[PDB]
Write a protein that binds this ligand. Structure first.
Ligand SMILES: Nc1nnc2ccccn12
Ligand SMILES: [Cl-]
Ligand SMILES: [Cl-]
Length: 163
């Protein structure tokens, strides 16, 4: 575990993370995809061997000794708000199990279902709160990776609020 487990946020490419493992915002078929998934495919292509897994699950594949946790959030274009909310919560619970099983002291994580799976809605608060529900009982240092400056500010404020 980390000596004083923390949450941090950084605005940069998750493929350049400084953590002991990465969470991919994966599609269920293990395809290269776009966004986080495509940068992850370019950085760790070996990790996409038998990475396909259902919505609401996480499957870890090693790239050398570096663990890539493929976490499949729901595409809110396809799910009802209610069913999507349940699957998004479940994907993060499966991430917490994998991070714990791997015995890592740190993990790089994107906000699942906030990009091309958002069904065109702002899901910063919904996705971040499900991340906290899952990860709060783990002792890994969590570093959240985001793209836009307003998202970095809002994620940083939500972390600082609970400290
Ligand atoms: N994950 C994330 N970071 N910045 C943004 C901006 C829009 C939608 C999702 N985002
Ligand atoms: Cl960058
Ligand atoms: Cl997404």
């Amino acid at each position: 575990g980390a000596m004083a487990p923390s949450y941090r946020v950084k605005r940069m490419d998750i493929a350049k993370n400084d953590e002991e493992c990465v969470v991919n915002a994966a599609n269920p078929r293990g395809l290269p995809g776009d966004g986080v998934c495509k940068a992850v495919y370019k950085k760790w292509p070996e990790s996409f061997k038998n990475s396909a897994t259902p919505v609401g699950t996480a499957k870890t594949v090693m790239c050398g000794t570096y663990p890539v946790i493929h976490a499949v959030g729901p595409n809110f274009s396809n799910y009802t708000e209610s069913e999507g909310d349940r699957e998004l919560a479940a994907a993060y619970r499966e991430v917490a199990k994998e991070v714990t099983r791997l015995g890592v002291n740190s993990v790089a994580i994107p906000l699942l279902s906030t990009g091309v799976y958002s069904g065109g809605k702002d899901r910063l608060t919904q996705s971040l709160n499900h991340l906290f529900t899952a990860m709060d009982s783990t002792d890994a240092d969590v570093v959240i990776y985001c793209r836009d400056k307003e998202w970095e500010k809002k994620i940083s404020e939500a972390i600082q609020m609970r400290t």
